[PDB]
Every structure is written in C-alpha cells, then in structure tokens.
C-alpha cells in the first residue's frame, strides 16, 4: 500500500552515508553468511580413520584385554547417554556434531566401469563397517528409542547416521539392528517410530495462504525458503528411507517384525502407521491441488511445494513397496485391510486431473 512505497525510497540512506561503526557491524554479519558459512572443508573421513586407529596398543605392555579405540569410546559414551533414563532426550552438541561426522565419513560423495562400481561398493562396506563394528548400529536404535516420539535435531542426525550405515541394504547392519531389538525387547523403539510418524508434517494450506498474502502485500520474507509449509520434508524423507533400508533386499525378518513384534509385551504396526501417513499426505496433496485448480498458472512458491510433497509421497510409496516386495503375506494382507485404497483412489484423481 501507501506506507511501503513512500518511506523506503527517501528515508533510505546509502551505505556510504552511514556511520563507520554501523557499516562495520553490517559487514561483520554479511561477511559471515557470505564467506564463513560458505566455506566447506572435508575432514570427516580422515578424522574417523584417525579415531579408529589403535595407537600402539599391542606394542604397549598392558598385559590385559584389547582396549577400545577412541571411536569405540565415543560410540559407547553416546550409547550410554541414550541408555540412561531421562524425561526427555536432551539436546547434545557433541552427539549432533559426531553423528554428522560419522555419517559423512561413510559416503565420500560418465557411466563408471564395473570395476569402479565394485570399488565404490567395497569402500562403502568398509566405511560402514568402521562404524557398525564399534557399536554404532545399536546406538542409533537407542537414540531413537530414547527420543520418545519427539521430532528434533537429535533425531534428525540419528536417522541420517542410520541411513549412512544402512546404505546399499547392508545385511550385516540389518542383522545387528534386528538382533539388538529382539534381545532387548525394546518396545520404546517402535513406540517412538509411531510417535515420529504421527508428528511428521504435511502440506499446510492455511499457512501457505498466509505466507502468500504476506509476500504479496509487500511484507519482507523473514525466512529464505518459507519452510513453514511442509515443515520438515527432509526429516520425513529420512525417517521413511531408514525404514526402507531396514527392509531392503527382501529382508523377510524385518518385513515381519515391523508389522508384529512376537517377543514384545505390546506391538505397534509400523506398516499401518506408514499407510496412515500416506493417507494424510494424500489428503494434503489433494487439497493443495484443489487450491490451484481454478488458477491458470502455478507460481514457483507453489511448484516447489508440490515438489516437496511429491518427493515425500514417492519416498512413502517406495517404503510401502519395500514392505511387501517378495512374498510377504502378512504385510500384503495388512495393507489390504487398511486405508491404502482410500489413498490410492485420491492419488488417481490427482493424477488424472493434474496430468
């Protein structure tokens, strides 16, 4: 309106008219974001290699058992912190940093040769073994269990570390993860998974309309990417990719344990929870289409929102496919008696009209 146009142009003073200290203060905050935040150096693979090295321990005259190397000590500390009972999973700088360091240590990332691809697979396996041989596979389960269904950066790093150690459908890590759960009878792990699914966000049409009005009327976009509609798409994608990795390779044991837990006191149906979230995200996508149906052109703010929603929907569909691929009659018949059809019938309408 009237206020915005007139006061900016004339009351606005160029940078050279500002006092020196104010301009220096502006520079100190601009320089950070432009250079310091945009400076990247890769040290994770060397740090972890150095941390996993037993330093002169066999040469040391210990006359005792094999000492745990610094990486093992770090993983044991992080696992003990999670295993300690608390009301809430407390925010941890050290865990957040190191769960990213060890996650980045396992990936190191026209048609490559077969030898090159097998080189990359063997290196992947060795890098994942560097971690899951020191107890990292049981630590990511304990952290998720201690999360108690609360979304946060503490879980957003645990789920990425689990993905890093499970990439490629690692059968050894899958077996370790299943053995730990079956031995400890951890109901909290599945309860926290159900809670995280229930806390996963979807498309918010009201928030989108409010943001669109705010941008259109001229009020400054406070955040860079408008990450209030579909609040955490990356977290949801990681959460469902973790579950897909848990069953990749037609793992009939996880495929049956995620549905029913035989040894546990109580059972949570992750298969049904996944399809419930799929139905919710379908109901969000359908409404977000219905908003744009009358409009001729979809703007970029809408196009990127559709992209973020479709990525999540694709990941959930892939996870559901991995739940049932191979003969898995329990999972197939559990999805056959759920609200899966109510989501497919709406996705079909969206596909028929939007296409």
């Amino acid at each position: 309106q009237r206020k915005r146009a007139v006061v900016a142009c004339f009351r606005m003073a160029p940078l050279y008219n500002l006092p020196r200290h104010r301009a220096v203060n502006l520079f100190l905050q601009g320089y950070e974001k432009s250079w310091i935040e945009t400076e990247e150096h890769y040290f994770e693979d060397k740090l972890i290699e150095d941390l996993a090295k037993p330093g002169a321990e066999p040469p040391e005259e210990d006359e005792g058992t094999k000492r745990v190397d610094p990486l093992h000590q770090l993983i044991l500390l992080f696992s003990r912190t999670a295993l300690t009972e608390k009301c809430k999973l407390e925010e941890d700088f050290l865990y957040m940093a190191y769960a990213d360091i060890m996650a980045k240590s396992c990936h190191d990332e026209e048609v490559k040769s077969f030898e090159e691809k097998e080189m990359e697979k063997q290196k992947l396996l060795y890098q994942q073994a560097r971690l899951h041989d020191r107890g990292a596979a049981e630590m990511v389960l304990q952290t998720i269990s201690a999360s108690k269904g609360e979304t946060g950066p503490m879980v957003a790093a645990t789920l990425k570390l689990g993905i890093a150690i499970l990439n490629g459908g690692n059968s050894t890590v899958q077996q370790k993860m299943l053995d730990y759960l079956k031995e400890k009878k951890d109901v909290g792990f599945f309860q926290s998974l159900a809670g995280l699914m229930q806390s996963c966000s979807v498309l918010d049409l009201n928030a989108f309309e409010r943001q669109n009005k705010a941008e259109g009327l001229g009020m400054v976009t406070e955040e860079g990417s408008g990450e209030k509609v579909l609040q955490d798409d990356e977290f949801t994608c990681d959460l469902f990719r973790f579950l897909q990795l848990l069953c990749e390779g037609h793992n009939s044991d996880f495929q049956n344990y995620l549905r029913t837990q035989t040894g546990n006191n109580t059972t949570v149906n992750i298969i049904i929870s996944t399809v419930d979230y799929l139905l919710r995200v379908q109901e969000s996508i359908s409404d977000f289409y219905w908003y744009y149906s009358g409009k001729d052109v979809i703007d970029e703010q809408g196009q990127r929102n559709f992209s973020k929603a479709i990525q999540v929907a694709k990941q959930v569909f892939n996870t559901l496919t991995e739940y049932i691929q191979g003969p898995c009659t329990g999972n197939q018949q559990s999805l056959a008696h759920s609200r899966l059809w109510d989501a497919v019938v709406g996705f079909l309408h969206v596909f028929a009209h939007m296409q």
Partner: protein, 780 residues
C-alpha cells in the same frame, strides 16, 4: 594442623567445615565472604597454599576456599561474557593483525594486545573496624601478584616432582597435588591476571616444545590422572578461546579499513553516475538499484567476491584485499613432523590420551571429544562467535561498560533464589539499562547479548516460585514486563524475537490481570506488545495460540474471581475485569495498522461463536437482557455503593459497574474490528459476507443505538465555585461509546438518510450539545 594426618575424625570434620565455609559464600555472597575473612585469614590462606605436609583433603578444601572467597565472583563474571565480543572502534584496535610479522606463524595464545570490552575487576578491603556499608559489594581483596608468583613456583615444582614419579606427592596423591593447584592456576588464567612474561613461562610448563618462542616434558606429557586431564582440557579450551578472540578482533581491525574503502568506492560510483546519467538512461536504471536497496542488502551483494558469478560492482583492487585477508584468516584457522601449533598439539594429545587407556569418566570423554571437534572445526568457531560481535565507537565505550556491568549483575541473580534483597538489585539493574542510551542506540547489541531471554528466564523463575500459591514478588513481574514491552517498542526485530516466546506468555497469561494498577506490566501485555502494529507477526499467528485466549475468556465469563470475592466484591458468575484484558489481546491480534487481519478475525469470530460464554452473561441468548439493558444495569451498579465496591483509589477499589461497562465496550470493539473491510464486501466475498452477517446478528442495531443514546454526567459547580466532577473510573465514560460507533460503522454501516438522521437526533446531538456547553472557563 599437620597432626590431622593421623586423626581421621577431626580431619573429616574440618574438611566438611571447609566445605560449609565454601558453601555459605557460594555464588557471589560477598557479605559472607567478608565475614569468612575473620575466620580464615590471608596468612592462613597462604600457609595452607604453600605447605607440603598438609593433608590432601585439607589442601583441596583450602584451595577451594581461597577461590570461593576471593576469586570466584570475577571469574564467573568474566566467563559469562567470554562468549561475547564487543570490540571498540579505536586506534589501538585498528593496529591488530592476525599474525605478528611476515612469517605467518601463530603467536603464543594469550600474549598480545586485545581491545575487546571486559568486565571490570574491583575488590573491597576487608575491615571490621570500619562502619561503612559500601564494602559488602565486590569480593574481598587478595594479593594477586604474590598469588601469581607462588602459583607459578608451585606449578614448576610440581611438574619437576611428578616427572620423577616420587612416592610423596603433596597431599598424599597426585590427585591431591595437581588437581587443586591446576584449578587455582586455571582460575587465575580465567581472571586474566597473568600478563606477558608470566603467561610465556607458564605456556612452557603446559607444553615446552610447541610454545618454544622464536628432555623437558611439560604437563601434557606426564601420565596424568583423569581429574588432572579434565582440568588440562579445560585449560586448553580456554587457550583455544583466546585464539578465537584474537582472530575475531583481527577481523574487526581489517573491517574498519575495508568498510572505509568500500564506502569511498560506493560514493565515487554514485557520483560518477549522478554526473553521467545523461550519457545513457538505461544504465542508470540498473545502476541505482544499489542506492535504493536497504543497507544490509547493499553490502550483501557487494560481498559476492567469492565464486565466479561476479556481479558485484566492487572493483578488483578492493576485491584482492578481502580475498587475501580471507586466505590469511583460513591459514590462521588451519584450513589449508613437528606440530608447532596449539591446534595440532590438542588434536594429537586428545587422540593419544584416548588410545592409551579407556577413560572411565564420561565427563572427561565428553571434554576430550568436544575439544577435538573444536580443533577439527576451526571455521565453526567463527560462525558461532561472529554473530555475537558488535563494534562501538570510542565515545560509547564507558556507557557500554556500564550497560555490560548492569547486564552481568542481572545475569548473576539467575543462580540465586529470588527474594527481597534481589528484588531491589534487579529493579535497579533494569532501571539502569533503561536509563542507558546504548539500550536504545544499539538494539542489535542488546539482542545479541540476549537480555530479553535473561529477563524471560528471571520472570519464569519468579512465576514458578508462587504460581499456584498466589503470586509472589509482583513488583518483579511488573518491572520485567515493562522492560520487555519497552524492548518490543525499541525495534521491529526486537518485536520479532520477542514473538518467539508467545507460547509461554500465553501459558502464564492470568498472572496479574485482576490486580489494579498493574496494567502494561503483565505477561499478556508483553504478548500484546510482541504483536502490536506488526502485520507480519500478526499473520504469523497460529490458531492454537488463539484458542488459548478464547478458552481463558470463556473461563472468565463462566467463572468468578476468587481474589475479588475474597476481598468482598459481590459474587457474580463471571469476571468482567479479567475478560477485558483477554479481549484487548484479541483486539491487537485481529487489528493491525488500521486494517483488520482477515485470517485472524475470521478465526476469532468462529471461536467466540463456538464458545458463546465469551460474550458475557447478557449476550448468551437464554435469558439475556441484551446489551442496552446490560449496560443500563451497570449504570446503576456503579452508583449503588453496596454492589460496586468490596463491601467492607482505583489501585485499591475495583468499580464493578465500570468493569462491566469496559467489558461490554471491549467485546463490541473486538467484534467491530473483526468485521471485514468493505473492499471485500463490495467485491462480494462469500466468507466476508457470512462473517458480517454473523456479527450483525450477534448485536441488534437498536442495542447499539440505545447505548449511544445513553446520557452522560456533566461536572457541576458548587456554591464555592469549586469544580465537583465525578470520577471517570466510576461512571459511564465517553471512551465506552467509541466502540459502539466503530461497530455500527464497520458491521452495520450508515447508508440511508433516515437512519443517519435518526442516529444523529437520538445520540449525537445530545453529546455535542453537552460538550459545547463544557467550553466555559472552569469546565474546559
């Protein structure tokens, strides 16, 4: 006292007595610290420091007592600002460089010229013959040069003794020999008493080879116990913080000249277009965007030196200065056989310690690994410290020091239980900050220091201590809420940051709503000031925050006020006093900059119609007399003294007629401000028409006309000639009729001459005729 090595009961009792001495003066109890100087003297607290035959428990108790009495307050005050960098813009500051000379080799950490503002170190002389009351501020004084010399000598001797692995450590164990002595050294280094040669000498004891300024094994290579290792990790972390501070001062030193050159270049580039725009009009259009862009964006797009996309207008000779400074800074941070650097030394020591043995202390493991992470992430320290950096000119240095002292005093009572003696201190601290001009000049510095969060936490503690058991320290809540409201009124970004605490402020929103004269000093008032006249913040409001206020207002309109009925006010079935305050916040939420927020008004109206108890007992519908009959009952209650008072001025007596009138002037004010703007109704929006229809059905037109037609009370002249004017806050007010006009205009509207003339003749002519007669000399 050396006979206690064989008497284990007196030894234990005296150790616990020393612990009680340390506890009674804990966390800045200076009055008790001065009193403890009469029981443990300085000669005693030097003899126990230096004695080698003392029991280990007594040695550790006495090192802890010395620090707690004398060196615990300033060390904590300095640690609370160790993560904050306020670098004055001075000539000595401008002379700081990253490296001492052309040879880009790191200097010894700590040694150098540092100009960042620092907490003041002041001590009071203990004396029990003086009768002054000014000595109970500041810790008791101690000889800090004798303490430095003794600490250095003892640390050297302990290093020499431990390397030989003797069977007689001081105190009986290496733990009793090193842990408390290293704690004292660490406290002294934290306080910063060591200077130049002393720090150079002690860095050689820490690591003789790395700190060899240009056989003997320092503390880092001594096969230390785990508690010793923990304190060495703390010392190394402080050493790293010293390097971070030097790196972050050297950035400001370069930034002065860089910003000067950038501003000169921008002025030159502006003039070179101002005198040459007639050459080409097209180029000026895309050249004046920088001069019309906000100052932050100007420098953000001037700082695109990196990469090769290179659309910044800054020339190459200014490019290659920042490009070289950044490379030198990365070299300093370590981002490219002998370590020759603190970073490499720590990175080696931590790994070597972890691989020599299994550490049994989780705290030691955590401290070891958080230090290794710091060493391997040198760029991650700058990204955390630079936001906490603010530069001030030379004239403001003393004022900023005073503000920082007041803030440190405010911060220091976050670790004490709030009481009468703390109420005065912090009211004084808040008042000094308010009377401090930097608080207004530099809101960004204030926000970076996070005083709003500190006051938030203090008021949280006060509310927790006395929420269910009636509010304690209401003057604290009042001062804290006034401070936070002024903080919102300072700047728009302050209001945005204060908006982030809306959830808690709505949680504790009934703190002092019914307390008279405590208006503008309530967490609900802070919540309202966090969204007042901010369109972006009002549109950022969520519904869950909105149902909370509606629930509270429904509870108020359904429930009576225990405190008022306990003071004796007549027990009606609702809360007119508390309801108006909840209605005011909704007013501020739905109305912004003279226009209704269409995404909040439509939610508020729906919530209020879902909960019809929010409309007051007279607009329920079942048995309600309406609105005109509702505010004519109040215009009789306010005159009946047995129904308007507590039945045995305004701060002590709530007027029960004026409260109902204010409630029924705030509800209609909110409902009229929730009416849609007429451009939407003219365009024919169905939701806007529906909302207007609901609002119009809620209040009849006659109930609005009658209230306007209600007469006023004119002041009268007595036989003396003195003006006998009835109290404003006890009767029907003109401000109470301002809501009826707004509602009748925004919801009903005036569109027909007949109704316009009717409304005039019945309600406006009496008011104008009674006001034009008040234009006399005394009644003006």
């Amino acid at each position: 006292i050396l006979e206690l090595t064989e008497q284990e009961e007196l030894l234990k009792f005296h150790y616990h007595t020393l612990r009680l001495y340390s506890a009674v003066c804990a966390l800045g109890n200076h009055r008790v610290a001065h009193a403890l100087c009469s029981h443990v003297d300085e000669p005693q607290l030097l003899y126990a420091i230096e004695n080698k035959y003392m029991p280990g428990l007594l040695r550790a108790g006495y090192y802890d007592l010395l620090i707690d009495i004398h060196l615990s307050s300033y060390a904590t005050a300095r640690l609370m600002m160790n993560n904050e960098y306020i670098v004055p813009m001075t000539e000595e500051t401008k002379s700081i460089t990253l490296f001492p000379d052309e040879n880009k080799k790191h200097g010894l950490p700590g040694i150098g010229l540092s100009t960042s503002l620092r907490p003041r170190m002041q001590f009071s002389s203990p004396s029990f013959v003086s009768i002054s009351n000014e000595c109970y501020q500041y810790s008791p004084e101690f000889p800090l040069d004798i303490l430095k010399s003794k600490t250095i000598q003892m640390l050297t001797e302990a290093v020499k003794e431990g390397s030989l692995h003797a069977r007689d450590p001081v105190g009986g164990t290496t733990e009793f020999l090193f842990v408390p002595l290293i704690k004292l050294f660490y406290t002294l280094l934290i306080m910063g008493i060591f200077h130049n040669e002393d720090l150079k000498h002690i860095l050689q004891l820490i690591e003789p080879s790395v700190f060899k300024e240009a056989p003997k094994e320092g503390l880092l290579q001594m096969k230390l116990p785990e508690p010793v290792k923990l304190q060495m990790c703390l010392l190394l972390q402080y050493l790293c913080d010293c390097q971070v501070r030097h790196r972050i001062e050297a950035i400001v030193a370069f930034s002065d000249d860089f910003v000067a050159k950038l501003q000169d270049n921008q002025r030159f580039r502006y003039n070179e277009v101002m005198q040459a725009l007639n050459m080409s009009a097209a180029l000026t259009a895309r050249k004046t965007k920088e001069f019309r862009s906000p100052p932050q964006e100007q420098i953000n797009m001037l700082l695109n030196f990196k990469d090769d996309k290179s659309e910044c207008p800054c020339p190459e000779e200014i490019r290659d200065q920042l490009l070289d400074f950044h490379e030198d800074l990365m070299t300093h941070c370590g981002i490219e056989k002998k370590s020759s650097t603190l970073q490499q030394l720590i990175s080696e020591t931590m790994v070597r310690w972890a691989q020599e043995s299994v550490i049994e202390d989780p705290e030691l493991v955590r401290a070891m690994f958080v230090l290794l992470h710091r060493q391997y992430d040198g760029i991650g320290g700058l990204v955390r410290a630079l936001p906490k950096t603010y530069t001030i000119n030379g004239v403001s240095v003393e004022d900023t020091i005073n503000l920082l002292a007041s803030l440190g005093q405010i911060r220091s009572l976050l670790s004490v239980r709030m009481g009468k003696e703390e109420e005065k201190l912090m009211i004084r601290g808040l008042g000094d900050i308010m009377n401090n001009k930097v608080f207004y000049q530099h809101p960004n510095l204030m926000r970076a220091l996070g005083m709003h969060e500190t006051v938030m936490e203090v008021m949280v503690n006060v509310l927790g201590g006395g929420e269910s058991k009636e509010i304690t320290f209401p003057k604290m809540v009042a001062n804290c809420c006034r401070f936070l409201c002024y903080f919102c009124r300072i700047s728009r970004q302050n209001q945005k940051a204060m908006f982030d605490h809306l959830s808690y402020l709505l949680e504790n929103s009934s703190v002092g709503l019914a307390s008279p004269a405590m208006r503008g000093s309530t967490p609900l008032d802070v919540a309202a000031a966090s969204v007042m006249d901010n369109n972006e913040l009002a549109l950022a409001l969520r519904e869950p925050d909105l149902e909370k206020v509606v629930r509270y207002l429904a509870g108020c309109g359904l429930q009576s006020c225990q405190m008022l009925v306990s003071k004796g006010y007549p027990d009606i079935g609702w809360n007119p006093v508390e309801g108006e305050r909840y209605l005011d916040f909704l007013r501020f939420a739905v109305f912004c900059n003279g226009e209704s927020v269409e995404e909040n008004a439509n939610v508020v109206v729906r919530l209020l119609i879902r909960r019809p108890e929010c409309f007051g007992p007279a607009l329920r519908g079942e048995g309600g007399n309406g609105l005109l009959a509702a505010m004519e009952e109040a215009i009789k209650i306010a005159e009946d003294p047995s129904r308007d008072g507590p039945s045995p001025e305004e701060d002590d007596t709530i007027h029960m007629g004026n409260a109902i009138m204010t409630f029924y002037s705030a509800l209609i004010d909110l409902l009229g401000r929730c009416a849609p703007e007429m451009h939407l109704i003219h365009a024919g929006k169905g939701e806007a028409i529906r909302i207007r229809s609901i609002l119009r059905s809620l209040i009849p037109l006659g109930d609005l006309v009658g209230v306007i037609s209600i007469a006023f009370q004119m002041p009268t002249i007595a036989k003396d000639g003195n003006v006998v004017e009835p109290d404003m806050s006890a009767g029907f007010c003109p401000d109470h009729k301002a809501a009826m006009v707004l509602f009748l205009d925004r919801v009903y509207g005036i569109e027909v001459q007949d109704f316009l003339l009717h409304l005039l003749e019945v309600g406006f002519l009496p008011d104008l005729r009674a006001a034009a007669s008040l234009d006399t000399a005394a009644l003006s």
